Nucleic acid binder design. Structure first.
Lengths: 52, 124, 39, 50, 135, 209, 125
RNA sequence: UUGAGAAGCUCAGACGAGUAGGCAGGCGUGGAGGUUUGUGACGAAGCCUUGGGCGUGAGCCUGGGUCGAACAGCCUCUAGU
RNA sequence: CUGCCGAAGAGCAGAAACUCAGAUCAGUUUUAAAUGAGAGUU
RNA sequence: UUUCAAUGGCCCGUCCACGGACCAAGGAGUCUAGCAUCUAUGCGAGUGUUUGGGUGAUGAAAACCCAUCCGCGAGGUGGGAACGCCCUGGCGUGCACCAUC
RNA sequence: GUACGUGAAAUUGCUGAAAGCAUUGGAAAUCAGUCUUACCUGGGUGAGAUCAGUAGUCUCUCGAGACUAUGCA
């Protein structure tokens, strides 16, 4: 924790260094897609692989 | 599905027969006056994408299976769930000690081996 | 005594809700098509 | 997963809550030689799974 | 950098693209189609936006509910030429370290585009701003 | 207790739960940040729960821990749970949401059961109003947009089911649905407002205060 | 792993140094283990071979053979042992040489210098 | 219904000459890092072969003969390719 | 190696960006609208 | 595979001419400095450790760290993406960008 | 076998057979791989184990594996 610091607090053994910030917050995207937040407003899905 | 091949002949290089210095691997004819590149009559064919085989039966040996090169016993155990879909092939550099162990294991697994009679003898 | 997962209970409510309307637009669609065929 | 060991088949299960303990990551159960019971065992141990 | 996918090799931007591919096609929202399109854009096509711009753009008529989250598919940089930062709520690809500290300490909160999606999956009450492409 | 509740050994975690009953049963005022720290330990006690049989006995144990708490800070205990669950809900992964869904279901019923218990000592409407006020500056707060809507859809789904379970025979007249009505009437997130009525199973039979 | 930049790990230099080693250096390169008893009574693991040492061949086609080292052929790093020879086509017994590491010394030819070497190299005569 | 290498799977329709020139994806060689619980004196590599197989192709796999000490797949790096 | 696009003999060919059936066009024809095509731009 | 049959089949490259007896091996857009665009990456009103100093007990030409400099940088109208509220459309907000005062 | 590791092609001799670029097939020569032993069902005889209205040990976390006895319903 002194070598690398935090994303908000600095490293002690590196000058002015903060751990990189991430583009996403929760990297589990299947958790985002299949959540009650998003699955409650999506339009009802058509078939998977469809018949001919 | 049956294993349909659109073509069975190799696409020999132009004038590979005329010269021993000219190999038989295909090279597109870069020439600008080349009659054969011009696809005259009787000129030998050139690799086109239309000869490409069916995506469902690509890579399939005449018996409907696909070759899966195998170097030891651990490899033949991967084909446990694909024995109707794949055939084991022992590499040429696998010794006759391992070849026997590969073949015996694969026999219980119900896996076809394309070269199971190699480097070995029978005693019965 | 393993209770069914909560997310599974939520999906069933949506699947049931979707199945209600698909069944609802079955007898009407059959009738409307049938009358369309006579027309 | 199902894998063989000494002529006996086992069901191996891992959950996310033991992800950081490789030694205790997989639990193992012994499946019956009875095929129907072994199928019942997989249903019973893997219920509400996908 | 193109129309079909991003040219970035960053996995987390691909994960964002994987999420907004879903919204783009399983919702009627035009907000989720725009976000997916702007996620395929290059660095120069996603010019940075500033804190001062965001406060200035969302002002004057700020007597409204102002629950509107500001969304940029880009970086929210800092503008130290302004002294007091209002209460803002911004969802961006990136915040610089001083931009994120100012929005938090004097004001509201900073989001990611996946945190927005769980808040406004249809982009409702959002101000989808853009940076100037003047180079 | 806090470090022990999040141990890597279930035996160590469990021994901190049994010792937590004495700590919570104290007749002294607990500061809000003290319950914030405790619930971070308790969150990881359930975050690390392994089997569904265990992780559902644990939810019963944690919900059964509410009546142990002192009456004066019993509301603080539950309000801190719903605040420690709102901020940490987004970071939960897809394979852990179903054990916390049951945890909120067990804590929703604990709230209704605590109202039932206190309805004997004092009039019901004061108890409900005090609990409703807890919901107002908690999950059903309109001023904050950080609270997840996945929890609020859960509470709407289970609100009447847990109410019926607490009073099998018949529930009295009270403002059971006040947090939801005031939310849909003033929520700043349209997705919540537009779909909360579609999920809530509000019955008009018992809602007239 | 070597840590000294005085010693080389270059194969080209090690091979050149081995084969272009002088006869004094080759004297140490041809060293044989002592038998268990000599190893456990002289407290020395291994000594350079000498003429008139009683050895046993340990490896090769002549395994198990014994004899005295008639001479040391230091140019080819080979030992020559009594009666360990090969018959030629004409009937001559041309000796065959063995590597000094492939034999074991079972009786040392103890000069005064060896005894001084023994005591110097942690030994007890 | 199990058919998420979501970079996957699936439905449909149209289209197909090509020099300069542009774009994309692949095959191969020497060396580098990682990897295959990799191959090897029960024979590595190479070479020979009217033996067999795969790929539209660049090419790859293999049987037999010869041989006798090293070699390769996969992910990146590099170039006197 | 295969594929795709593809001339000329400022114009002709693409790429990004925008603005788009609620748009303009056309190696066309009638009259003094018909028909085909989504059209453009820096 | 060889051969036969029927059918087709005019030597290749190069620019008539020029190269070609055959085979193997070697054999030609390379490295480096400058500039411009495009893409990716990190940070972002900043940015760039590697002139040098610190340091490195397993190889120490690496990796790690960094003082002082220094470079380069430093208001309305209409249309309009997106959004909210309504009873296709209307109303409000209106990024980027383009004509406008 | 020192004209010595491997030993390619061009090239030369001898022997054997045939004859006097592509398409498609014939003749001749050659070659690839090709299955039978299993499935179900019934009974008899014994076997054991994941069985015992059964006793113990070790490692993990009540029961989960590994065992050692004892029985063969």
């Amino acid at each position: 924790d002194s070598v690398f610091g935090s994303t908000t607090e600095v490293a002690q053994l590196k000058k002015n260094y903060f751990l990189p910030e991430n583009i996403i917050s929760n990297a589990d995207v299947t958790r985002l897609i299949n959540s009650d937040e998003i699955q409650s407003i999506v339009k009802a899905a058509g078939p998977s692989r469809v018949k001919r | 599905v049956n294993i349909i091949k659109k073509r069975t002949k190799p696409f020999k290089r132009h004038q590979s027969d005329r010269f021993k210095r000219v190999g038989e691997s295909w090279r597109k004819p870069r020439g600008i006056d080349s009659c054969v590149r011009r696809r005259f009559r009787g000129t030998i064919s050139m690799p086109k994408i239309g000869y490409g085989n069916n995506k469902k039966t690509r890579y399939c040996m005449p018996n409907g299976l696909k070759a899966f090169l195998v170097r030891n016993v651990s490899d033949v155990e991967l084909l446990l769930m694909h024995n109707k879909t794949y055939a084991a092939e022992i590499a040429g550099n696998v010794s006759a000690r391992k070849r026997v162990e590969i073949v015996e294991k694969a026999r219980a697994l119900g896996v076809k081996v394309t070269n199971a009679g190699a480097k070995v003898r029978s005693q019965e | 005594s393993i209770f069914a997962p909560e997310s599974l209970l939520k999906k069933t409510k949506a699947q049931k809700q979707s199945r209600e309307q698909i069944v609802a637009a079955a007898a009407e669609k059959k009738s409307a098509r049938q009358k369309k065929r006579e027309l | 997963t199902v894998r063989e060991d000494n002529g006996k088949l086992y069901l191996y299960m891992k959950t996310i809550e033991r992800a950081h303990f490789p030694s205790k990551l997989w639990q193992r159960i012994k499946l019956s030689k009875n095929y129907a019971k072994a199928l019942e065992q997989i249903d019973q141990q893997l219920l509400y799974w996908p | 950098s193109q129309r079909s996918k991003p040219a970035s090799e960053n996995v987390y931007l691909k994960l964002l693209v994987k999420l907004y591919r879903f919204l783009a096609r399983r919702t009627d929202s035009r907000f989720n189609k725009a976000i997916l399109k702007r996620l395929f854009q290059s660095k120069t096509n996603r010019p940075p936006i500033s804190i001062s711009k965001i406060a200035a753009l969302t002002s004057r008529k700020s007597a409204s509910s102002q629950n509107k989250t500001t969304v940029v598919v880009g970086t929210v940089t800092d503008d130290e030429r302004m002294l007091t930062v209002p209460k803002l709520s911004i969802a961006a690809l990136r915040f610089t370290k001083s931009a994120r500290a100012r929005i938090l300490k004097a004001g509201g909160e900073v989001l990611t585009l996946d945190q927005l999606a769980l808040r406004a999956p249809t982009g409702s009450n959002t101000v989808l701003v853009r940076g100037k492409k003047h180079a | 207790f806090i470090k022990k509740l999040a141990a890597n050994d279930r035996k160590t975690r469990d021994k901190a739960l049994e010792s937590l009953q004495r700590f919570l049963s104290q007749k002294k005022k607990f500061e809000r940040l003290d319950f914030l720290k405790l619930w971070k330990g308790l969150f990881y006690c359930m975050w690390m729960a392994d089997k569904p049989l265990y992780q559902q006995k644990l939810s019963d144990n944690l919900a059964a821990l509410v009546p142990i708490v002192w009456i004066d800070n019993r509301i603080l205990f539950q309000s801190t749970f719903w605040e420690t669950m709102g901020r940490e809900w987004t970071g939960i992964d897809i394979l852990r949401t179903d054990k916390f869904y049951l945890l909120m279901r067990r804590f929703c019923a604990a709230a209704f059961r605590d109202i039932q218990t206190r309805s004997k000592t004092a009039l019901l409407d004061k108890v409900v109003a005090e609990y409703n006020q807890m919901w107002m500056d908690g999950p059903f707060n309109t001023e904050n947009l950080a609270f997840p809507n996945g929890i609020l859809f859960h509470l709407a789904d289970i609100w009447t089911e847990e109410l019926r379970k607490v009073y099998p025979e018949d529930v009295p007249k009270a403002d059971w649905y006040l947090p939801f009505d005031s939310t849909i009437k003033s929520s700043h997130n349209v997705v919540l407002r537009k779909t909360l009525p579609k999920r809530l199973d509000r019955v008009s039979e018992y809602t007239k205060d | 792993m070597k840590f000294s930049r005085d010693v080389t790990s270059s194969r080209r230099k090690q091979r050149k140094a081995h084969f272009g080693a002088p006869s004094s250096v080759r004297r140490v390169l041809m060293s044989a283990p002592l038998s268990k008893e000599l190893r456990e009574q002289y407290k020395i693991r291994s000594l350079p071979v000498r003429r008139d040492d009683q050895i046993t061949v340990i490896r090769g086609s002549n395994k198990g053979r014994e004899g005295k080292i008639t001479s040391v052929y230091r140019k080819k790093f080979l030992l020559l042992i009594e009666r360990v020879t090969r018959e030629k086509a004409n009937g001559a017994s041309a000796p065959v040489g063995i590597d000094a590491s492939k034999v074991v010394i079972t009786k040392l030819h103890l000069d005064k210098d060896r005894k001084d070497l023994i005591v110097r190299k942690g030994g007890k005569v």
